[model samples]
Target: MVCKCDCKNQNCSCNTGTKDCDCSDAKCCEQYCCPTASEKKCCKSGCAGGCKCANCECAQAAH
Candidate 1:
């Protein structure tokens, strides 16, 4: 399942993979921010111009 904080589709499901997701613990998946978290670099690079970073390449992007 996707994480509620990330829109690019973060695999944070309490029923799959690690089978451990309290729905708020992002560190389990290396997701280092909340829905209201400030602008910080996540992926190797941000989605600049028209180059849309697919999948988790953006990690926290497109905004």
Candidate 2:
């Protein structure tokens, strides 16, 4: 999985989810919740990855 915080960090402190927990402070679309201000949002209501904001479409998309 890609670290959204890392991708948006200015100091690269969020190089990975293991590096720093910027999920709450940073805009991480690829994190537990989609970025607060991302235009290109990913449907994560059920992001299989256990994201709170994930659009629950995993089972539906399987079909």
Candidate 3:
């Protein structure tokens, strides 16, 4: 679930049924996104280790 905020064609934040750690904050996407080992908590936690797709820098690809 790797996603870039400005990707323009991917699953991003605060949507429905999509998967990604994100929230309601513009600054959150600028330098904010989910990381490794974290598939639940967003913008409030290494991201548990480390987005695009709301994951600035993920360990894998695809959603």
> Each candidate: what lDDT?
0.35, 0.36, 0.37
| RMSD after Cα superposition, model 2 | 9.6
lDDT by residue (1-63, candidate 1, tens digit) is 334333332344444333445444433333333312212233333243233333233334544
**Model 2: per-residue Cα lDDT over 1-63, one tens digit each:** 234443432332355324654433544444322332232244532233434433332223322
Clashes of each: 0, 8, 12
Which candidate number would show the highest TM-score if scored against the true structure? 1
Total clashing pairs in model 3 = 12
Q: What is the overall TM-score of model 2 with all chains considered together? A: 0.19
Which ten-residue region of model 2 has the weakest summed lDDT?
Answer: 54-63
TM-score, structure 1 vs. true: 0.22
Candidate 3 positional error at 54, Å: 20
| Per-residue C-alpha lDDT of model 3 across residues 2-63, encoded as one tens digit per residue | 34345332234435434443633332243324432233343343232343333335544544
Q: Estimate each model's TM-score.
A: 0.22, 0.19, 0.19
Q: Provide C-alpha RMSD values for all models, in order.
A: 9.6, 9.6, 10.0
> What's the distance in Å from true for residue 48, model 2?
2.0
Span of ten consecutive residues with least summed lDDT in model 1 = 34-43
Q: List the residue pairs that clash in candidate 1.
A: none
lDDT of 1 at 29: 36
